[PDB]
Amino acid sequence: CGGRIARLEEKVKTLKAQNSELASTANMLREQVAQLKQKVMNY
């Protein structure tokens, strides 16, 4: 074989990418929600 494999690879590439995307996004909302949470800690 030599066609459906390479393709499945390109697909696994776009998937792993988007993953790192939403990953960094959640990382930003996490660090920010952490500093904010601490500021809320006072009651």
Residue 43: both structure tokens together? 């009651």
> Which residues form the interface with a copy of itself (CB under 8 A)?
1, 4-5, 8-9, 11-12, 15-16, 18-19, 22-23, 25-26, 29-30, 32-33, 36
Would you say 29 or 41 has its CB closer to a copy of itself? 29
Least distance from C-beta 7 to a copy of itself, angstroms? 10
Smallest distance, Å, CB 43 to a copy of itself?
14
SS (H, E, C) 1-43: CCCHHHHHHHHHHHHHHHHHHHHHHHHHHHHHHHHHHHHHCCC
